[PDB]
Design a protein around this ligand. Structure first.
Ligand SMILES: *C(=O)[C@@H](NC(=O)/C(=N\OC)c1csc(N)n1)[C@@H]1N=C(C(=O)O)C(=C)CS1
Length: 358
């Protein structure tokens, strides 16, 4: 690393780890195209395994970025349109509240109050139809954004129906493989388990459990290297040889709705750069990030704007992550930790690092 990068990383990450008691963390900095890696602490406290560049972290809701891109790749292949009604892909959704709710609404949390999580009692396919058939909206479609795994989760499950593939198999073949993300998994294969960090919640070692629509909303595990390569791929999508993937990435950073000073893409969220850091830092706090807000349609959607801060927070019960980049500045960051610590602490550290490098 250039000395600039070590100094701001160490001066920023050391106090964060101490403040938050994070057992293991990996950071990548993307700077003038190339990634620079830092690791601290333990993947596995008990067995004294260090965090390395090969350690797998659970990405949590950062998985929604892969989901948004794969959905974008399906649009670009001609298989779906964001203007299609939900019912085109799930006809059994016959309850009348589903009228007028499109793929766009699902992908962007604007369907009218679909909930944060799919409840744990929803295990089977028929439980899932049931859950969506019996849900009643809080609002008309396309008036309020409420951040929701049940919403983007359903988008991803529907968006792969036309391809004929499982969502897993579509993600593998259409996103992971072409980008050479070869240590990124929805299901960790048994031979790779030795690299799988434990998550820590109130001291207990934990992994994420199976759940309805887990792959679509929070199901990806990856390494700091592969996540660096995911950021580079989203920073510079024209370098990607597969046409539909290249367009898919650009569709996921298109601006569909605005609330306050933020815009909703497909899994990614964006703000104009130069950004006010107060708004990203405070905006990431759950009190705000999880609240319903009114949305203004961007008519028509703005194509990926280079001069943007593009980002996503994610957590599971035992992990906490964050990815942010700025395409105009050829700059990005990935922060993976095996503890779920508050979002504003993540964003503030990323902001400290990146504004220092621009
Ligand atoms: C995304 O990260 C998603 N998070 C979750 O679904 C979980 N935990 O979040 C704190 C989760 C999934 S499986 C498991 N054991 N835990 C949504 N994101 C957030 C977030 O802070 O980004 C949440 C508020 C919970 S829901």
């Amino acid at each position: 690393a250039p000395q600039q990068i070590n100094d701001i990383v160490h001066r920023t990450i050391t106090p964060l780890i101490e403040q938050q008691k994070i057992p293991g963390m990996a950071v990548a900095v993307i700077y003038q195209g190339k990634p620079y890696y830092f690791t601290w602490g333990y993947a596995d406290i008990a067995k004294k395994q260090p965090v390395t560049q090969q350690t797998l972290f659970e990405l949590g809701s950062v998985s929604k970025t892969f989901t948004g891109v794969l959905g974008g790749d399906a649009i670009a292949r001609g298989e779906i349109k964001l203007s299609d009604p939900t019912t085109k892909y799930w006809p059994e959704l016959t309850a009348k509240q589903w009228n007028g709710i499109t793929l766009l609404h699902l992908a962007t949390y604007t369907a009218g109050g679909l909930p944060l999580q799919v409840p744990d009692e929803v295990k089977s396919s028929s439980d899932l139809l049931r859950f969506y058939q019996n849900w009643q909206p809080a609002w008309a479609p396309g008036t309020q954004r409420l951040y929701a795994g049940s919403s983007i989760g359903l988008f991803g499950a529907l968006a792969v129906k036309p391809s004929g593939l499982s969502f897993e198999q579509a993600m593998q073949t259409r996103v992971f493989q072409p980008l050479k993300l070869n240590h990124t998994w929805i299901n960790v294969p048994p031979a790779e388990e030795k690299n799988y960090a434990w998550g820590y919640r109130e001291g207990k070692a934990v992994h994420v459990s199976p759940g309805a629509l887990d792959a679509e909303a929070y199901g990806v595990k990856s390494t700091i290297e592969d996540m660096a390569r995911w950021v580079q791929s989203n920073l510079k999508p024209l370098d990607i040889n597969e046409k539909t993937l290249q367009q898919g990435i650009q569709l996921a950073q298109s601006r569909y709705w605005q609330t306050g000073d933020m815009y909703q893409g497909l899994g990614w969220e964006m703000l104009d750069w130069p950004v006010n850091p107060d708004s990203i830092i405070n905006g990431s706090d759950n009190k705000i990030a999880l609240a319903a807000r009114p949305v203004k349609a961007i008519t028509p959607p703005t194509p990926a704007v280079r001069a943007s801060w593009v980002h996503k927070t994610g957590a599971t019960g035992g992990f906490g992550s964050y990815v942010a980049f700025i395409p105009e500045k050829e700059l990005g960051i990935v922060m993976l930790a095996n503890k779920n610590y508050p979002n504003p602490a993540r964003v503030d550290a990323a902001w400290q690092i990146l504004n220092a490098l621009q």
